[PDB]
């Protein structure tokens, strides 16, 4: 690695380079992070259930460690995530009697969470995924069901963005989602963000999770989605990038190593993707991977528990893969 290029330096004129982390992987992958990234996201410890597990009980210790690491290495931090249909405790939606709370009460609890969390990290965290994954991933409706939406109404996203803006008006506020380049879902995401901006809501950015495979989305699809979203005037971040060795239909559990063909195609795929990101450097300002090396990835257990995946630029021994060399040479 002594003579290896540094990802953040190669892309210094193009976008930040980030990694998702937790206190354990910061220790396990510390030198790779130090050597390559200039942005960090908490993989899990800034989600609602990890910050306010019980009402009025805030547990910032893990998030604090992650921010302390970033700040001491001059890394930016993306805050992930305030309002989501997952990893939010049941207390949030319920009264003492157990019934669902009212719209007004859920808005007070949303405001209190957002205010307390965003104000704690103001001046250290420069952007927040305020709404995560509200758009439907299947069927014809615009929006996914969620208790947030059930109890407040469809203006729950408007309110979340306004509460976060009040808590830190210097932050960039994002709508973040996956399968963001499939045309039907891209059109829903575009319509939704257009409608919020058309009302003056402080949404500044779209986060493209980019939980991609070797084949999907196509490069034409990615291009079209970047152009579509940029045409709204928002900032784009690629927020959770990984390139799975398995397509969505491939639920094999048996593979103990990637084939040479998978490794080669993944290298080609990452070179193609980075070439496209560099081409859109004027609208893409950050590319975060959902990890940094193949010794830690949520894809080992999702969508199939207990297998192994190899989605990143560095292998389990933290050495560069064929994908690294193509990514850095665009």
Which is closer to Na ion, CB of 17 or CB of 203?
17
The span from the CA of 223 to the CA of 228, in Å, is 9
The span from the CA of 189 to the CA of 229, in Å, is 8
Among 228, 241, 238, 297, CA closest to 269: 241
Catalytic residue of the set 49, 158, 180, 240:
240
Which is closer to Na ion, CB of 41 or CB of 146?
41
The pairing of beta strand 39-42 with beta strand 235-244: unpaired
Q: Which residues pair with 41 in a beta bridge?
A: 20, 78
3-state secondary structure of 224: helix
Least distance CB 244 / Na ion (angstroms): 26
Least distance CB 203 / Na ion (angstroms): 19
The span from the CA of 303 to the CA of 250, in Å, is 10
For 143-155, letters b (16+ CB in 10 Å) and e give ebebbbbebbeee
| Residues 63, 67, 68, 70, Cα dihedral to 10° | 140
Is the distance from CB of 328 to CB of 10 less than 8 angstroms?
Answer: yes
Interface stretch with Na ion, choices 14-22, 50-58, 202-210, 243-251 (CB under 5 A): 14-22
Catalytic residue of the set 43, 49, 133, 180:
133
Question: Known catalytic residue: 240?
Answer: yes
Which is closer to Na ion, CB of 207 or CB of 258?
207
Q: Which of 44, 94, 116, 285 binds Na ion (CB under 5 A)?
A: 285
Q: Which of 281, 302, 319, 329 binds Na ion (CB under 5 A)?
A: 281
Q: Contacts from 64-69 at CB under 8 Å and sequence distance 24+?
A: 65/23, 65/26, 66/21, 66/22, 66/23, 66/26, 66/40, 66/42, 67/121, 67/124, 67/125, 69/21, 69/26, 69/33, 69/40
Question: Known catalytic residue: 247?
Answer: no
Which is closer to Na ion, CB of 16 or CB of 326?
16
Least distance CB 107 / Na ion (angstroms): 36
Q: What φ, ψ does residue 52 adopt, rounded to 5°?
A: -135, 70
Binding-site residue total for Na ion (CB under 5 A)? 3
Least distance CB 285 / Na ion (angstroms): 5
Residues 24-63 contacting Na ion, CB under 5 A: none
Least distance CB 102 / Na ion (angstroms): 43
Interface stretch with Na ion, choices 7-15, 76-84, 251-259, 269-277 (CB under 5 A): 7-15
Which is closer to Na ion, CB of 15 or CB of 324?
15
By CB under 5 A, residue 15 contacts Na ion:
yes
Interface stretch with Na ion, choices 10-18, 88-96, 139-147, 185-193 (CB under 5 A): 10-18
Binding site for Na ion (CB under 5 A): 15, 281, 285
Catalytic residues: 133, 240
């Amino acid at each position: 690695n002594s003579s290896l290029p540094s990802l953040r330096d190669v892309f210094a004129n193009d976008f930040r380079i980030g990694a998702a982390v937790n206190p354990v992987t910061i220790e396990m992958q510390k030198q790779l992070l130090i050597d390559h990234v200039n942005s960090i996201t908490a993989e899990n410890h800034m989600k609602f259930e990890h910050l306010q597990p019980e009402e009025g009980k805030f547990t910032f210790q893990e998030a604090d460690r992650i921010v302390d690491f970033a700040c001491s290495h001059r890394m930016a931090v993306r805050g992930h995530t305030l309002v989501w249909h997952n990893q939010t405790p049941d207390w949030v939606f319920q009264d003492g009697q157990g019934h669902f709370v009212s719209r007004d009460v859920l808005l007070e609890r949303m405001k209190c969470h957002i205010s307390t969390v965003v104000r704690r990290y103001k001046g250290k965290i420069y952007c927040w995924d305020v709404i995560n994954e509200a758009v439907a991933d299947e069927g014809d409706e615009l929006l996914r069901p969620s208790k947030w939406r059930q109890i407040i109404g469809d203006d729950f996203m408007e309110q979340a963005f306004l509460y976060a803006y009040e808590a830190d008006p210097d932050a960039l506020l994002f709508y973040n989602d996956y399968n963001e380049c499939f045309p039907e879902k891209r059109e829903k995401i575009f319509a939704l963000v257009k409608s919020l901006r058309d009302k003056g809501i402080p949404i500044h950015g779209i986060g493209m999770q980019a939980h991609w495979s070797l084949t999907r989305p196509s490069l034409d699809e990615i291009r079209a989605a970047i152009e579509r979203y940029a045409s709204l005037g928002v900032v784009l971040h690629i927020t959770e990038l990984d390139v799975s060795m398995f397509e969505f239909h491939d639920r094999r559990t048996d593979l103990a190593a990637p084939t040479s063909e998978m490794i080669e195609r993944q290298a080609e795929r990452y070179g193609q993707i980075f070439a496209l990101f560099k081409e859109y450097r004027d609208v893409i300002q950050s590319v975060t991977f959902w990890g940094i090396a193949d010794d830690h990835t949520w894809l080992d257990n999702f969508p199939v528990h207990g297998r192994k995946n190899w989605p990143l630029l560095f292998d389990e021994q933290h050495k560069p893969k064929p994908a690294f060399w193509r990514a850095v040479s665009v």
